[PDB]
Write an enzyme that holds these catalytic residues in place. Structure first.
Site, PDB file in Angstrom:
ATOM      1  N   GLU A 133      43.270  45.173  44.958  1.00  0.00           N
ATOM      2  CA  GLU A 133      43.407  45.087  46.234  1.00  0.00           C
ATOM      3  C   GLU A 133      42.892  46.101  46.980  1.00  0.00           C
ATOM      4  O   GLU A 133      43.112  47.402  47.033  1.00  0.00           O
ATOM      5  CB  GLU A 133      45.144  45.148  46.428  1.00  0.00           C
ATOM      6  CG  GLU A 133      45.488  43.980  46.111  1.00  0.00           C
ATOM      7  CD  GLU A 133      45.492  42.668  46.816  1.00  0.00           C
ATOM      8  OE1 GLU A 133      45.244  42.532  48.004  1.00  0.00           O
ATOM      9  OE2 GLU A 133      46.224  41.575  46.275  1.00  0.00           O
ATOM     10  N   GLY A 134      41.867  45.978  48.071  1.00  0.00           N
ATOM     11  CA  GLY A 134      41.025  46.740  48.781  1.00  0.00           C
ATOM     12  C   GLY A 134      41.753  46.635  50.271  1.00  0.00           C
ATOM     13  O   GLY A 134      42.780  46.332  50.486  1.00  0.00           O
ATOM     14  N   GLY A 163      41.378  43.316  52.177  1.00  0.00           N
ATOM     15  CA  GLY A 163      41.070  42.264  51.239  1.00  0.00           C
ATOM     16  C   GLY A 163      41.148  42.340  49.694  1.00  0.00           C
ATOM     17  O   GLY A 163      41.309  43.495  49.152  1.00  0.00           O
ATOM     18  N   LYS A 164      41.142  41.534  49.243  1.00  0.00           N
ATOM     19  CA  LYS A 164      41.446  41.152  47.688  1.00  0.00           C
ATOM     20  C   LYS A 164      40.059  40.981  46.863  1.00  0.00           C
ATOM     21  O   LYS A 164      39.308  40.321  47.425  1.00  0.00           O
ATOM     22  CB  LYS A 164      42.383  40.160  47.293  1.00  0.00           C
ATOM     23  N   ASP A 178      37.843  56.820  53.336  1.00  0.00           N
ATOM     24  CA  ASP A 178      38.671  56.521  52.448  1.00  0.00           C
ATOM     25  C   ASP A 178      37.785  56.875  51.122  1.00  0.00           C
ATOM     26  O   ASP A 178      37.974  56.381  49.897  1.00  0.00           O
ATOM     27  CB  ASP A 178      39.405  55.169  52.013  1.00  0.00           C
ATOM     28  CG  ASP A 178      40.481  55.209  51.059  1.00  0.00           C
ATOM     29  OD1 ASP A 178      41.097  56.707  50.849  1.00  0.00           O
ATOM     30  OD2 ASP A 178      41.061  54.452  50.513  1.00  0.00           O
TER      31      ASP A 178
HETATM   32  O1  OV0 Z   1      33.381  45.064  40.182  1.00  0.00           O
HETATM   33  C1  OV0 Z   1      33.628  45.528  41.605  1.00  0.00           C
HETATM   34  N1  OV0 Z   1      32.685  45.260  42.435  1.00  0.00           N
HETATM   35  C2  OV0 Z   1      33.361  45.540  43.536  1.00  0.00           C
HETATM   36  C3  OV0 Z   1      34.593  46.241  43.212  1.00  0.00           C
HETATM   37  N2  OV0 Z   1      35.693  46.513  43.929  1.00  0.00           N
HETATM   38  C4  OV0 Z   1      36.733  47.482  43.384  1.00  0.00           C
HETATM   39  C5  OV0 Z   1      37.907  47.865  44.158  1.00  0.00           C
HETATM   40  C6  OV0 Z   1      37.455  49.027  44.900  1.00  0.00           C
HETATM   41  F1  OV0 Z   1      36.326  49.429  44.784  1.00  0.00           F
HETATM   42  C7  OV0 Z   1      38.578  49.474  45.678  1.00  0.00           C
HETATM   43  C8  OV0 Z   1      39.916  49.129  45.614  1.00  0.00           C
HETATM   44  C9  OV0 Z   1      40.114  47.917  44.815  1.00  0.00           C
HETATM   45  C10 OV0 Z   1      39.173  47.398  44.190  1.00  0.00           C
HETATM   46  F2  OV0 Z   1      39.482  46.213  43.380  1.00  0.00           F
HETATM   47  C11 OV0 Z   1      36.849  47.062  41.733  1.00  0.00           C
HETATM   48  C12 OV0 Z   1      36.028  46.466  41.056  1.00  0.00           C
HETATM   49  N3  OV0 Z   1      35.725  46.297  39.711  1.00  0.00           N
HETATM   50  C13 OV0 Z   1      37.019  46.355  38.958  1.00  0.00           C
HETATM   51  C14 OV0 Z   1      36.727  46.280  37.569  1.00  0.00           C
HETATM   52  C15 OV0 Z   1      37.507  46.210  36.660  1.00  0.00           C
HETATM   53  C16 OV0 Z   1      39.069  46.177  36.923  1.00  0.00           C
HETATM   54  C17 OV0 Z   1      40.204  46.078  35.795  1.00  0.00           C
HETATM   55  O2  OV0 Z   1      40.009  45.059  35.038  1.00  0.00           O
HETATM   56  N4  OV0 Z   1      41.306  46.612  35.978  1.00  0.00           N
HETATM   57  C18 OV0 Z   1      41.685  47.798  37.041  1.00  0.00           C
HETATM   58  C19 OV0 Z   1      43.148  48.221  36.449  1.00  0.00           C
HETATM   59  C20 OV0 Z   1      43.026  48.119  35.070  1.00  0.00           C
HETATM   60  C21 OV0 Z   1      42.484  46.674  34.929  1.00  0.00           C
HETATM   61  C22 OV0 Z   1      39.434  45.894  38.309  1.00  0.00           C
HETATM   62  C23 OV0 Z   1      38.566  46.175  39.366  1.00  0.00           C
HETATM   63  C24 OV0 Z   1      34.730  46.032  41.805  1.00  0.00           C
END
Ligand code: OV0
Length: 269
Positions: A17-18, A21-22, A122
């Site tokens: 969750e950013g 958006g999700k 942020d």
């Molecule tokens: O690959 C991406 N391309 C864009 C992007 N954004 C985000 C992001 C952010 F930057 C800010 C806030 C929220 C977000 F989701 C994450 C993200 N990759 C992720 C990779 C692995 C896990 C996961 O398997 N997890 C996490 C807890 C343990 C299990 C989750 C996210 C990506």
């Protein structure tokens, strides 16, 4: 090529969750043989459009890669399976030098962003993604704004400089304060028990929650700061404190920090 189609995109799982958006993981497979690339897709109105318009413009080695858009609009980015430093550092014992490399890499991306006349708003370990073991990429531009002026008139308060908390003015130098906090997070290995919210709320307490921001502002203006992380060298903590100067104009720019971090990286390597 910029356009992805709903029919060839299949969901694997949620990523997180950013801001506004999700983020979800999809495999984009036109050929129907799982040969096609895995992609991160963020989905939602006024500010959402802005995140798409910002990240479409940006291209840099330490900014998350924009791949395209899709009709739900949805934002398609590269997939970085290792996730955030907040997720990654608590499980992987990473040495001091590697942590300083990540710090250098963040400043290079932030120096780029500022030169494009954007503020992030942020900059925190949760928004710094690992592409690989020695490659950070800054994510989540949901709060990012175009600077009109020296600042934008404006919330993750435990990463925010006094001027943001007090005067609702976000400067380029406000992002440097936030980088200071992010550097604190890296050096604690993003340990929950040593996090900025945990530590600041220890100092403030929770007996009077209506005045959290007031009490935070006051302690910062008194000159109180997050403690030195265990095994953090003094030199590095001074750099943190320099990023947390109360007066915004006394803080170094991200251009100033880059060669400093290069040299500190080279020392501990
Ligand atoms: O690959 C991406 N391309 C864009 C992007 N954004 C985000 C992001 C952010 F930057 C800010 C806030 C929220 C977000 F989701 C994450 C993200 N990759 C992720 C990779 C692995 C896990 C996961 O398997 N997890 C996490 C807890 C343990 C299990 C989750 C996210 C990506």
């Amino acid at each position: 090529p910029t356009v992805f189609h709903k029919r060839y995109l299949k969901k694997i799982r949620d990523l997180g969750e950013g801001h506004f958006g999700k983020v979800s993981l999809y495999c984009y497979d036109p050929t129907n043989d799982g040969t096609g690339e895995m992609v991160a897709v963020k989905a939602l109105r006024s500010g959402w459009k802005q995140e798409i318009d910002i990240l479409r413009t940006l291209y840099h080695e330490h900014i998350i890669k924009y791949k395209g858009c899709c009709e739900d609009l949805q934002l398609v980015m590269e997939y970085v399976p290792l996730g955030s430093l907040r997720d990654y550092l608590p499980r992987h014992s990473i040495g001091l030098a590697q942590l300083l490399l990540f710090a250098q890499q963040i400043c290079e991306g932030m120096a780029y962003l500022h030169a494009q006349h954007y503020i992030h708003r942020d900059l925190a370990a949760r928004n710094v993604l690992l592409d690989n073991d020695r490659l950070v990429k800054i994510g989540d531009f949901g709060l990012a704004k175009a600077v009109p002026h020296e600042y934008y008139r404006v919330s993750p308060v435990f990463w925010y400089a006094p001027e943001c908390l007090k005067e609702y003015k976000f400067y380029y130098a406000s992002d440097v304060w936030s980088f200071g906090v992010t550097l604190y997070e890296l050096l604690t290995h993003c340990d929950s028990s040593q996090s900025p919210p945990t530590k600041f709320l220890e100092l403030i307490g929770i007996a009077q929650g209506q005045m959290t921001v007031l009490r935070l502002t006051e302690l910062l203006e008194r000159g109180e700061r997050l403690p030195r992380p265990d095994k953090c060298p003094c030199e590095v903590y001074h750099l943190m404190k320099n990023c947390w100067e109360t007066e915004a104009s006394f803080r170094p720019t991200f251009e100033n920090l880059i060669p400093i971090l290069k040299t500190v990286h080279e020392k501990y390597q």
